[PDB]
């Protein structure tokens, strides 16, 4: 005999539409058994749950069993496999036999791709035989049903493509338990927090927004982490209290952790009352920093510390960018009301990497959105079929994690091979690209930014609205801007600040023919030269004559570094 | 019923940070049970302890149990396995059932890779079933918990790669019990010596200091080795005594070991009184020399006697190296104040056998930091999913014992498999490597040095600053160095040594454009020419005229060999 378990039904949320459908399909046959028998009409047999790992498939099934109050028979992937070639099949029979005999019940097949994979991919005579056993069992249920047998077979899988097309046909109902979005994460957070006394400064909405690739289990842990962090105050109190009851002078201490441990060991039968404290928003942020995501090894690319303050001038461009990208992301309400469709893509042309990197990253950071950077010819192969498949993969990855900015650096290679007939490989890639661009735009969230140092030879087809229609021209040469950049870089140091020196450096001819990346390099070069001076002087004095170290940087260091460094 | 044991908590030391973390996670749920029940918040369930064998994992667990005063349930690797196919599973259930019933308790799973290894590596139907039983038990605990059930599951393993990824996910907290310290070894030595009568000249502190990568088991053996060494005096005494009782003249001897054996055999029923002697410091040093752990594949690697005085010239390279490695280790204050992130790695490229290994050791030695050397194909295994986990392990070990220099010799194997699509295994490994490199930059202490005799096909991604960005070019063209090499090779011969000849040979133009391998070949070539002279002369004289053979080598042989041989 196998009775049901006690799991919390108030734990799962964000699955409103799907749970409703499940309820409709499962409630009538299980709960009103007498009614279905009298009518003579047939019902739903198999319910397949799919989606990514940790999506709450196992929990949903467990919850449903507990809530209805029916008998739960858990069939895990390797639980039926035995030692001898026959015991496995015998067990499958017994499972189905006992199940049909006792009703109402819920049979749950957790991780089904391990038992019933494609019969062409399995060259073993045991695996094919097991699939056959399942099929036979399914038929037996169908025949017995009009008497008073009420059993529903639930199943969970992570990938539908790995399953045998034959079993797919047998199963009738399918529920998609998809990716936890911003809204979904918010809901999950609320479910977990339900039993906790939250403070007024805590905004679960803010937490959800700044939580990219976290799953239901991860969020569960973030909540637990916050709990431990809050109870550090009580630990400090106990330490002070212990050192007063049992002093032990300085004999109990060799280090800090060991002394704390020893005091607690001495106490033993001492019971203490713990005050119920509230958690802060700061504690949650601390907890979030210490937690790890799931999709971290893929094409994620983290957003740098680049803001608008790092970009000198280009105020007109800044405003235009805000309108296009920040407008639809932050204000969807505004766009729906007026009547226009959100953006798809923009194109940047002019100076190089320095200008492009500062633009691409600044906009991306500000929106607090994801960023992916694919640079020029670092995609092409000698073979005929991986290049196109790779491009498809990039867009799929981008689609999965929205909001995201997809950045294409140096497009002068791929695009001009259309106007004149030359290569076949280049033709295929560009055509796939055009195709991918047109496809996305209705659902949005994915904004494509293209950049090139050369605007002349480009195909007009790519330029067309809906693809990369917004052509933004970028230019960097101006003195006032350079001074601002120098100040911004030298702002992040921590006495001697020296403003006059910064202005003079900017005035020089060599500085005029520079870029953002060049100025950064100049700063680093000056720092290195200064270190050389400090090292040579200090070592000479210490050995011949221990003194203090001086991290101060003067003009002589800047001048020498300036003389050597060249642009691009 | 199973009550706690009485083990000394003052025995384990050197684990300050780790013990503190363990305290935080284990103290609150076990000690203040009433408080956690009232609040309704959830806590930590599983704590996994990893690291090498004899690191004190079993002792730490035992100590923690005794110190807190909770019930200790020891579950060893083969303690739950029975005779029939069902008794094993029944026992696992009973363990979890009794454990949840009685609280507060600590369940300790010692050596878990024997019970729950990878389910793909286990083709048995019993092993997979046992893993399933553990999973089911884990879930049962989680459900029961809000009532008043307080049980923490501790576990110890020697290798994280062998564990099933499924159980890894179930366990939440992980503690790394890495490299044993100087203080810790001192303590272990004292524990073992406890029953022995040590002399006054023995300083256990000195032993511990000069014992780098030895574990608890190794130290145990060093003590045993000392015992055998002392009892050699008694052996000599018995030998002399035996040769007096039963002389047997010279009939009992053909060799030395055999005669000794024969005498003892004759005696049989002769009982002798053994005097209790004290061990010396000299005997311990002798014992230490004969002991060897080797640790891992390469394991621990002590720093050689290589300084800057062993390297001829390359003064520019020396200064650059000092800046990068010695700069951040010795002067962290300087780097934080200026504003730049510490080094992560450098690359050494040039001609075959120029002394790349020697330069690497010199830098490491000078910083008085640790050194690990992993050479080319001495990394690859037969397994697939273990390669990536092994790389992760290396970085974890390096992180634990910082400051350390991680040296990769002959990188020509791993790096070129990016520019052209080879396979999937190579792709995963290199991507994991890039990931590991990016992570280490702010935390630092671990500086990665790469060396290769071939620079052509390498991915630019690895070359980027922050990874192996600093490309240092090395060569070998100095006269003084060549003389030293010639002397070193001609040192291993055994009359006529001749120093003047060696210097002149080095001076020649043909010698200037050479390498270490070339000089070795020249020496061999000269030896061959000399043999020809000896053979022709000896045969002519013996036949026409048996005389003696002359192994002497003059300058004429060297000159002829020198004329013919060409470089590479
Ligand atoms: N949608 C969700 N809402 C609340 N909690 C969740 C959700 N999804 C997962 N969790 C938490 O994560 C845990 C894992 O859930 P579960 O094992 O059901 O996921 P899964 O999709 O079945 O994973 P797998 O299929 O790989 O076993 C649950 O115990 C739950 O605490
Ligand atoms: N860190 C340490 N401090 C003091 N003594 C130690 C330490 N580590 C080991 N020892 C000594 O060595 C013995 C072995 O310890 P223990 O069995 O806990 O190591 P282990 O890591 O659990 O080994 P394994 O996991 O292979 O069983 C202990 O009884 C102790 O006397
Ligand atoms: N197997 C060895 N490992 C390290 N040092 C060696 C070895 N054999 C000789 N040496 C030392 O190095 C000098 C010889 O240099 P060699 O031509 O072997 O180049 P190397 O870089 O030291 O060795 P390798 O090229 O094998 O790394 C000698 O002075 C000798 O003392």
State the pairing for strand pair B71-75/B105-110: parallel
DSSP assignment of B25-45: HHHHHHH-HHHHHHH------
Span from the CA of B486 to the centroid of ligand 3 (angstroms):
12
- d(Cα A470, Cα A476) in Å, to the nearest integer? 20
The residue to which tokens 């273990």 are assigned? B386
Token look-up 């994460």 returns A185
Q: In which residue are the tokens 């010596």 written?
A: B193
CA-to-CA distance for B69 and A428, rounded, in angstroms?
A: 71
Tell me what percent of chain A is helix, strand and coil, each rounded to the nearest 5.
50, 10, 40
Mutation pick from B25, B125, B442 vs chain A, by most beta carbons of A within 10 Å, is B125
- A343 in Cβ contact with A328 (< 8 Å): yes
**Cβ A255–B125 below 8 Å, yes or no?**
no
| Inter-chain residue contact A254 with B13, CB threshold 8 Å | yes
Residues of B in contact with A274 (CB under 8 A): 32, 34-35
Closest CA to A453 of A482, A415, A488: A415
Distance from the A234 Cα atom to the nearest Cα atom in chain B, whole angstroms: 10
B211 has binding-site annotation: no
Residue with tokens 């490491």: B364
- Chain B CB contacts of A264 below 8 Å: 27, 31, 67
Overall residue count recorded for chain B in this entry: 568
Name which of B19, B35, B129 is nearest A261 (Cβ-Cβ): B19
- In SS3 terms, B375-438 reads as ECCCCCCCCCCHHHHHHHHHHHHHHHCCCEEEEEECCCCCCCCCCCCCCCHHHHHHHHHHHHHH
Among B383, B395, B407, B499, smallest CA distance to B441 is for B395
Partners of A537 on chain B (C-beta within 8 Å) are none
Q: Is B224 helix (H, G, I), strand (E, B) or coil?
A: helix
Query: Ligand 3: distance of its center to the CA of B463 in Å?
Result: 28
Gap between the Cα atoms of B479 and B506, Å rounded: 7
Residue A11 CA, closest ligand 1 atom number: 4
Ligand 2 pocket, B56 CB below 6 A? yes
- CB–CB of B325/B332 below 8 Å? no
- SS3 letters across B162-193: CECHHHHHHCCEEEECCCCCHHHHHHHHHHHH
| Residues B44 and B152: beta-carbon distance below 8 Å | yes
Q: CA triplet A249, A250, A252: central angle to 5 degrees?
A: 95
Experimental method: cryo-EM
**Pairwise CA distance, residues B367 & B404, whole Å:** 9
CB contact under 8 A, B69 and A221: no
CA atoms within 13 A on the CB side of A341: 10
CA of A12 to the centre of ligand 1 (A): 9
Atom of ligand 3 nearest to the CA of B516: 17
Ligand having the closest approach to the CA of B305:
3
Distance between A345 CA and the closest CA of chain B, angstroms: 28
d(CA B306, CA B373): 15
Nearest CA to ligand 2 atom 31: B188
SS3 B349: strand
CA–CA gap between residue B216 and residue B53 (Å, rounded): 8
Angstrom distance (rounded) from CA A198 to CA A206: 14
Written as six digits, the tokens of B283 are: 């005997």
The full DSSP string for A351-397 is S-HHHHHHHHHHHHHHTT-EEEEEETTSS--SSSSHHHHHHHHHHHH
The neighbouring-strand residues paired with B348 are B451, B472
A323 CB within 8 Å of a chain B CB = no
B207, B284 Cβ separation under 8 angstroms: yes
End-to-end distance of chain B based on CA atoms, in angstroms?
A: 77
Across the A/B interface, how many CB contacts are shorter than 8 Å?
107
A531 vs B: CB within 8 A: yes
Helix/strand/coil percent split, chain B, to 5: 50, 10, 40
Structure tokens at B447: 């500086």
> Residues near ligand 1 with C-beta < 6 Å?
A 11-12, 53-59, 156, 158, 188, 191, 216-217, 220
B46 to chain A, minimum CA–CA distance in Å?
13
Instruction: Please list, residue by residue across A147-157, b when 16 or more beta carbons sit within 10 angstroms of its beta carbon and e when fewer do.
Output: eebbbbbbbbb
DSSP classification of residue A279: B
B422 annotated as a binding-site residue: no
Buried b (16+ CB within 10 A) or exposed e, B203-240: ebeebbeebbbbbbebbbbbbebbeebbeeeeeeebee
CA distance A346 to B469: 33
Closest CA to B96 of B154, B141, B61, B150: B141
Three-state DSSP at B525 gives helix
Chain B neighbors of A557, CB-CB under 8 A: none
d(CA A58, CA A46): 16
CB B475 within 8 A of CB B348: no
User: What is the rounded CA–CA span in Å between residue B52 and residue B168?
Assistant: 18
CA distance A376 to chain B (A): 14
Q: Which of A256, A261, A527 faces B338 most closely, judged by CB atoms?
A: A527
Determine contact: B142 vs chain A, CB below 8 A.
no
Ligand 1 binding pocket mutation candidate from A10, A48, A55 (most atoms within 8 A of CB): A55
Distance, CA B28 to ligand 1 centroid (Å)?
26
- Cβ(B281)–Cβ(B199) below 8 Å: yes
**Residues B434, B463 contacting (CB under 8 angstroms):** no
Test B38 with A276 for CB contact under 8 angstroms: yes
Tokens representing B232 are: 């050699």
- DSSP state, B3? P
B460, burial (CB in 10 Å: exposed 0-12, middle 13-18, buried 19+): exposed
Rg of chain A's alpha carbons, rounded to an integer? 33
Cα separation, B110 vs B155, in Å, equals: 6
The DSSP code sequence of A477-514 is --HHHHHHHHHHHTTS------HHHHHHHHHSHHHHT-
Q: Are strands A105-110 and A370-375 parallel, antiparallel or unpaired?
A: unpaired
Q: What is the resolution of this structure in A?
A: 4.5
Is the backbone of residue A354 left (phi > 0), alpha (psi -120 to 50) or beta?
alpha
User: Hey, are the CB atoms on B334 and A549 less than 8 Å from each other?
Assistant: yes
Query: Which structure tokens are listed for A516?
Result: 């953002």
Contacting residues of B for A276, CB less than 8 Å apart: 38-39
List, in sequence order, every residue forming a beta bridge with A407; answer none if it has no partner. Answer: A373, A449
Cβ separation of A527 and B339 shorter than 8 Å? yes
Distance CA A101, CA B366 (A): 79
Burial label, A215 (beta-carbon count in 10 A; 0-12, 13-18, 19+):
buried
Q: At what angle do helices B386-400 and B425-439 cross, to 10 degrees?
A: 20
**Residues A485, B537: Cα–Cα separation, whole Å:** 84
Max intra-chain CA distance, chain A: 107
Phi first, then psi: give them for residue B339, nearest 5 degrees: 115, 0
């Amino acid at each position: 005999r196998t009775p049901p378990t006690k799991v919390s039904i108030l734990d799962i949320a964000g699955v409103d539409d799907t749970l409703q459908r499940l309820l409709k399909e499962v409630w009538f046959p299980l709960r009103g058994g007498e009614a279905c028998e009298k009518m003579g009409y047939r019902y739903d047999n198999g319910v397949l749950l799919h989606g990514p790992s940790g999506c709450g498939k196992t929990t949903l099934a467990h919850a449903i069993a507990g809530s209805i109050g029916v008998a739960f028979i858990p069939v895990s992937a390797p639980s039926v496999i035995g030692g001898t070639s026959g015991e496995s099949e015998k067990n499958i029979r017994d499972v189905f036999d006992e199940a049909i005999r006792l009703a109402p019940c819920l049979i749950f097949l957790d991780q089904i791709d391990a038992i019933a994979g494609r019969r062409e991919s399995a060259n073993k005579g045991m695996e094919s035989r097991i699939v056959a056993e399942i099929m036979n069992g399914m038929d037996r249920i169908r025949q017995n049903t009009p008497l008073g047998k009420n059993v529903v077979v639930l199943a969970a899988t992570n990938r539908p493509e790995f399953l045998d097309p034959a079993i797919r046909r047998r199963f009738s109902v399918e529920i998609d338990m998809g990716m936890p979005s911003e809204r979904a994460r918010e809901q999950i957070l609320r479910s977990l927090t339900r039993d906790l006394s939250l403070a007024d400064d805590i905004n679960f909405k803010e937490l959800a927004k700044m939580t990219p690739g976290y799953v239901g289990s991860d969020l569960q842990y973030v909540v637990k982490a916050a709990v431990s962090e809050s109870f550090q105050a009580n630990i400090d109190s106990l330490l002070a209290q212990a050192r007063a009851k049992h002093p032990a002078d300085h004999l109990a201490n060799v280090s800090q952790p060991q002394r704390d441990w020893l005091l607690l060991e001495a106490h033993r039968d001492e019971e203490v009352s713990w005050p119920s404290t509230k958690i802060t928003m700061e504690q949650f942020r601390k907890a979030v920093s210490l937690v790890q995501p799931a999709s971290k090894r893929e094409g994620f690319s983290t957003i740098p510390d680049t803001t608008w303050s790092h970009v000198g001038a280009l105020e007109d461009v800044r405003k235009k960018l805000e309108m296009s990208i920040i407008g639809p992301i932050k204000n969807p309400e505004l766009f729906t009301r007026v009547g226009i469709k959100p953006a798809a893509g923009i194109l940047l042309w002019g100076p190089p990497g320095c200008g492009k990197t500062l633009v691409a990253k600044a906009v991306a950071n500000e929106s607090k959105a994801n960023f992916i950077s694919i640079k020029g010819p670092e995609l092409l192969n000698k073979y005929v079929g991986e290049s196109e498949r790779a491009v498809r993969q990039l867009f799929s990855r981008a689609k999965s994690s929205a909001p995201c900015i997809l950045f294409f650096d140096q497009m002068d290679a791929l695009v001009p091979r259309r106007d004149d007939s030359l290569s076949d490989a280049s033709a295929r890639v560009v055509n796939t690209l055009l195709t991918e661009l047109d496809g996305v735009g209705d659902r949005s969230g994915i904004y494509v930014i293209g950049a090139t140092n050369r605007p002349d030879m480009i195909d007009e087809a790519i330029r067309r609205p809906g693809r990369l229609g917004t052509s933004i021209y970028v230019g960097l040469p101006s003195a006032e801007d350079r001074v601002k950049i120098l100040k911004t870089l030298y702002r992040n140091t921590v006495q001697g600040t020296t403003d006059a020196d910064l202005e003079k450096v900017a005035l020089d001819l060599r500085c005029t023919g520079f870029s953002g990346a060049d100025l950064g390099n100049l700063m680093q070069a000056a720092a290195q030269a200064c270190l050389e001076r400090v090292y040579t002087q200090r070592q000479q004095k210490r050995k011949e004559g221990e003194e203090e170290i001086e991290p101060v940087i003067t003009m002589e260091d800047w001048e020498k570094a300036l003389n050597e460094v060249k642009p691009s």
